[PDB]
Design the sequence.
């Protein structure tokens, strides 16, 4: 029964472990199991993981609201469609389902939902356009993007023909993919519908625009459906209050 | 006929094995619970016993009644049920005594040379003349209830036969009384004190000769 | 050691001579006059609607009549990978698009009716079909289900592994003249890739019932 | 007396150790012994262990209520006896001891009692039949099992002759052992008298049935006693609230 | 009414969270909707794992047993409070994985619920019906004074 | 049919009278005996007891290591005629395998008593 | 100043260390010394230890109350003296010192006192007899022991001549040592004056008896003094409430 | 489930760590980050240090 005199150590009592730690740590917990070791649910190859790797999610195209082109080559040198390029698409560019005195339900792409869960973002965005013509029709389109302008008031077919643009022949394919890169003064871009600043006080890090430049056997109306996914070099930064919520229950209680 | 491919007693689908009834008997279950009021206790009570709790691996004889319904509808736990299938045992118990509403100190003594006289616990005053106070030199354990209200103790198998008898009714059949008591002058509050005793098998425990199970009753027709 | 072998001790009965070929299933006809965005041409519990495509006069499906569904008559558990081909018939003077996607065990999600919108269909495994080129398009549907085997008969609702959608991505649009069509024809071919049946019983030991439709 | 400055560590105080851990762990406890090390009761070979290995318990046959066969080969092509095959035997297939306004006492087999302590189960079940004839009598029996039907309403001697069946000659032995395997759509089967669902809303993973196909020197009545034990490949899964209790005290307090 | 070892909440365990009722007297659900975990869960069809919980039960001073019933169907999408808890979950059971914590020592319970359930998957986005990892039960262990409020 | 099983120190269990039912006897070590073949059947009973030795005389009740059961598994059934028997005869042979005696005294130093029966 | 994030550990606070541990452990304590290490009182060979090894204590003979033999060879074939053989000697076999309304003081042997501190016991007991004759006298004595009888009602010179006995010639020495072995059905024997059972409801694991088979120059009376010590193979088992107490204060307070 | 009897150690509870220590020590703290290791803000040569010597 030898006496063990070792000096007591100073210890700081706290009520629990980290509420914020996701990775690279081991956390103590009382597991409600019969076995008292490090145990995990059994698996095979088919119930198998890393189906949540972000690049694998934001890679899936998501559909944006289809606009149409009406009566050809139509209106000489005109602006068809344009929007600020950033990971969450603008609420007017998204298939909506309104209901009266509930919230508005938006069919956001996979890239938009993932970017509502993070604080910053950066990298190229892919757009995939799908043209509802048939080879009889012809036209031309100038898709260009301008890197530092946030509002369409100032751009026109001769100002936008001096940026990086591809001229699309409207008959070489139905599915055309146009990548707008990431050209900014800064290394991470905040989201538009979380923080920081004041909603419509926002500046996207570029604009994408679609410019122009009538048979009776063929349908007059050519419909275009735009798809949007994140590029190969796209990343998200800090976990933040999700800008979105599930529409499981679309009810709300205004003040 | 063809045989069904194995999952190693569940290690393939869940994470663990389930091949021994000895392993389920190492998960605590309620042994006895009850209240002790101030009059029900003893008159000159300065270092005195509170319960004399006979230690059976097959548990106590459950009295099913209205004011605590874990015994009425669940009957007795998995440990009395596994124990009824075996004739002898050679091991100790693990206990957890959670004594509520008492703030000073609670000595717990183990009397391994005592016969198995009762199948119920003896409360307060009625505890015999020679178990009525803390003895000397018996294995004991005092715990101040302000620091921690849970006592974890392991009772050893100190008893002279080749076995200890399960399913019982010298008479040295088992591991004798455990005694729980207060260590000083205390205010026994109104509504007395509640003691909850949980138990399980220890790691040096065994079940030995397998006779049959007795006839069972189903929980589902208790109401 | 794979988990279909952990459900059934009896080995599987594999008859590739009478399964594993392209079977015709349905043909559906969509109009110029009710073809809008998100119009549902086909909304079926799959492969339940394909295998029970043959009906009685009293409307109970009988596996007995097609040599492809002959093992579905005599077993009770089954598992198989599928492929749905969709063919639309090429008319040059019209244009429109079809989107076909499959939703694993879709019918029991709490948000099922919200996932019909063709915006949401571009996120599950899908294929696109024109009327010009891109006539045929083959989907692929591996077996993914809660339990390693599906039930083949009732006692509810056997063989419901998902929901197959065919919707109008770009509306069926015509020229304004009389030589233009009022509709087209869309035909759905199915086949099974790894068909494993188990629990071989008689026939007439379990029954089928008149099948129920998705809302 | 050198000063030891080491930063205090964060510690989380809790009242006790795991209430659920049975295996693969070491638990701290205050042992009421004179010796302060890892000590265990002494042993020899004869007081020696693993007499509780589950396969060794569920291997022992347990008797189910004996039914009898009356006036031979008797009734042409008839159903003698049948029950759903699952580890707990049906309450009407078990030797009972009723008493008035107490509970009902059932002599469950060793396989039934062990399966009242677990949440899932799987694997083959052995039946051992014992015929109280003597070689003078003769008959035939078709024991078959059907893997996916839960109620006997639909089966008959020609429907059950198409399943896996053995035809037993009623004179080759008294003791006949018939193993019904495990053929299901799922990997673990819930018990019938614990959770989950609603008692008589249960589906066993198969049915076993016994079909048919009168001297004056021999006893008319042939009695059959069925025994049931778990097969060699049988397993149990999660510890759950025992469906049974000891009949030590068969008294009860209905609401 | 006769409440000596009784259940307090019967809490159905869903990875996609509960069906949020947004209301006036606790506004984390009204304005934040549901957290990042229901949102990530809605994108996937199945899951195979367990949960980690933290139950912080305030205004109670004795002991709080927490039991996990892995073989129970997914009957409700809301939690069941107090008395209404069914007849057979109304008290602490035997032999289920449980964990008692004295609330004077520490008011936070950290528990990990395992995946004990027989299918290849557990269903996310749900509405036998063995879809998930069944009820967790929280309860008091003795006679207590249930305070005002 | 006859079922014969042995219950180690059976007489002192609290549930003794419940374990007589022949359903419970099929779970302890047992043997089955017909009237046709399977006439003889030998049980085996190794020494298993609380203490390593049994007492041979009184001062209560020496040599009580268990209880031997012989019960009717399938009832004794006859043909309905007069050449049939009304009973049969069942004979029980014993023997001892490892007999160790210790504590050799005289005789007449301890007594026996008129033996008591199980209820 | 690098941040050290390590997950806090779960710890269970208790008020003290083991109250029961005597050996094979190290206990923490706050020592009231100037030196802060593992320190012990100084020693030499002469202040040196293990003078408490039990075998060394129970080896010392202790005297039991002397009985005498009166008027030789005396009464033909008679019982002189007999007692149950067990480590605590019977209270009527021990030198006593009564006092009125105090306790009774017993001069127990070294073997008796040590066996009042333990719960079980086993092994042989040595008796040493000392005869107060002188060579003129002669007689014979049959000391026998009987292994399983607890009361002397039934034994006599011809029943006790069939046990293990030595016939002592009463003149070969004064000091005769007679060892009764340990022959029982059990491996440890409870004590008679602690627990378990009911005092005079006790059975010693054997009896020892002394049987028989007058000058005027020599003293008529031969006095015999019996001594008792534990044999070489004697052991004690579990520490229990001492059956005895010091007579430092022989006062008491009856209820 | 072997019993582990090890004698409890004496420990002195205090509310926090050193208020005075600047250097040559490691201090425990609860970091409000997703990553649970020893993590520091990223750097290059130009955002680079000991400009406070």
Sequence:
């Amino acid at each position: 029964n030898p006496p063990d005199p070792t000096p007591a150590k100073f210890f700081v009592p706290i009520p629990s472990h980290s509420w914020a730690h996701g990775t690279n740590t081991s956390e103590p917990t009382n597991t409600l199991r019969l076995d008292g070791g490090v145990v995990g649910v059994g698996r095979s190859d088919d119930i198998g993981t890393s189906d949540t790797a972000i690049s694998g999610i934001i890679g899936v195209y998501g559909l944006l609201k289809p606009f149409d082109w009406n009566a050809g080559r139509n209106v000489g040198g005109h602006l068809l469609w344009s929007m600020p390029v950033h990971p969450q698409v603008d609420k007017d560019q998204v298939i909506q389902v309104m209901t009266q005195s509930k919230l508005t339900q938006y069919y956001l792409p996979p890239i938009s939902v993932v970017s509502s869960l993070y604080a910053y973002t950066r990298g190229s965005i892919k757009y995939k356009f799908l043209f509802g013509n048939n080879p009889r029709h012809n036209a031309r389109l100038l898709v260009a993007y301008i890197p530092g302008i946030s509002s369409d008031n100032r751009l026109t077919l001769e100002r936008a023909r001096n940026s990086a643009h591809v001229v699309f022949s409207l008959n070489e394919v139905s599915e055309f993919v146009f990548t707008v890169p990431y050209i900014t003064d800064t290394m991470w871009w905040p989201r538009k519908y979380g923080g920081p600043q004041a909603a419509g006080e926002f500046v996207a890090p570029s604009y994408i625009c679609m410019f122009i430049l009538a048979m009776e056997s063929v349908p007059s109306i050519v419909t275009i459906v735009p798809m949007i996914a994140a590029g190969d070099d796209f990343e998200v930064a800090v976990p933040a209050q999700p800008a979105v919520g599930l529409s499981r229950n679309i009810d709300v209680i205004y003040p | 006929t063809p045989l069904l491919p194995t999952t190693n007693d569940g290690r393939v689908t869940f994470g663990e094995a389930f091949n021994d009834l000895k392993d389920l008997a190492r998960r605590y279950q309620l042994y006895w619970e009850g209240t002790i009021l101030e009059g029900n206790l003893r008159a000159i009570r300065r270092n005195s016993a509170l319960v004399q709790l006979p230690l059976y691996p097959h548990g106590l004889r459950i009295q099913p009644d209205v004011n605590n319904p874990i015994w009425n509808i669940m009957r007795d736990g998995h440990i009395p049920v596994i124990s009824s299938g075996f004739r002898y045992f050679r091991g100790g118990l693990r206990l957890r005594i959670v004594v509520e509403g008492l703030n000073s100190c609670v000595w717990v003594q183990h009397h391994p040379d005592r016969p198995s006289i009762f199948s119920r616990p003896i409360i307060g005053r009625y505890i015999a003349a020679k178990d009525a106070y803390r003895n000397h030199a018996y294995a004991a354990y005092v715990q101040n209830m302000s620091v921690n209200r849970t006592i974890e103790v392991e009772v050893p198998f100190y008893q002279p036969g080749l076995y200890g008898m399960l399913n019982a009714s010298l008479r040295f059949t088992g591991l004798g009384d455990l005694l729980i008591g207060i260590e000083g002058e205390q205010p026994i509050p109104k509504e007395g004190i509640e003691i909850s005793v949980y138990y399980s098998i220890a790691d040096d425990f065994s079940f030995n000769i397998f006779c049959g199970f007795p006839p069972m009753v189903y929980c589902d027709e208790t109401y | 050691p794979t988990w279909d072998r952990l459900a059934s001790s009896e080995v599987s009965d594999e008859y590739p001579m009478l399964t594993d070929r392209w079977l015709f299933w349905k043909s559906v006809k969509w109009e110029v006059n009710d073809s809008a965005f998100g119009k549902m041409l086909v909304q079926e519990k799959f492969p339940q609607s394909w295998v029970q495509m043959d009906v009685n006069v009293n409307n109970i499906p009988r596996y007995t009549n097609i040599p492809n569904f002959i093992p579905f008559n005599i077993h009770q558990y089954m598992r198989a990978d599928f492929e749905v081909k969709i063919y639309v018939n090429p008319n040059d003077f019209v244009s429109g698009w079809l989107i076909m996607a499959f939703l694993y065990q879709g019918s029991e999600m709490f948000d099922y009716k919200l996932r019909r919108n063709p915006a949401a269909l571009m996120q599950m495994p899908h294929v696109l079909v024109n009327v010009g080129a891109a006539n045929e398009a083959t989907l692929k549907i591996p077996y993914r289900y809660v339990r390693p085997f599906m039930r083949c008969k009732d006692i509810t609702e056997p063989l419901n592994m998902g929901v197959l959608f065919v919707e109008v991505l770009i509306p069926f649009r015509t020229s304004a003249a009389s030589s233009a069509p009022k509709s087209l024809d869309v035909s759905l071919f199915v086949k099974m890739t790894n068909a494993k049946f188990t629990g071989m019983v008689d026939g007439s030991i379990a029954l089928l019932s008149k099948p129920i439709a998705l809302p």
The CA atoms of residues 29 and 44 of chain F lie 8 Å apart. The beta strands of chain F are 2-8, 30-33, 66-72. The two ends of chain F are 24 Å apart (CA to CA).
